[PDB]
């Protein structure tokens, strides 16, 4: 009844909080992965040097 519904709301509210943190953490990984490409591209400047 009222108590079980109130429970479902608190549960659904925290799960939303979890979704926000998830999207954030996924964006973390993408950013650190984008770093990888960025470092590979500055190696390009040094391999032009070596030619």
């Amino acid at each position: 009844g009222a108590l079980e519904e109130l429970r479902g709301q608190y549960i659904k509210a925290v799960k939303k909080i979890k979704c926000d943190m998830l999207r954030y953490i996924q964006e973390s990984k993408e950013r650190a992965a984008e770093m990888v490409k960025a470092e590979v591209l500055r190696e390009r400047q040094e391999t032009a040097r070596k030619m």
Binding site: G1, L3, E4, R7, Y10, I11, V14, K15, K18, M21, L22, I25, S28, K29, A32, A33, M35, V36, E39, V40, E43
Partner: protein, 43 residues
Amino acid sequence: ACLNTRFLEEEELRSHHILERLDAHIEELKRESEKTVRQFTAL
């Protein structure tokens, strides 16, 4: 190079762990609240 890839691999590991801790706080809420409901519903 290998600083950043190893950085990413670390990120991946920390991503899984913080994820566990969030699922824990949720599962604990589900158990605590289910008990509150059950017992007060007996009233």
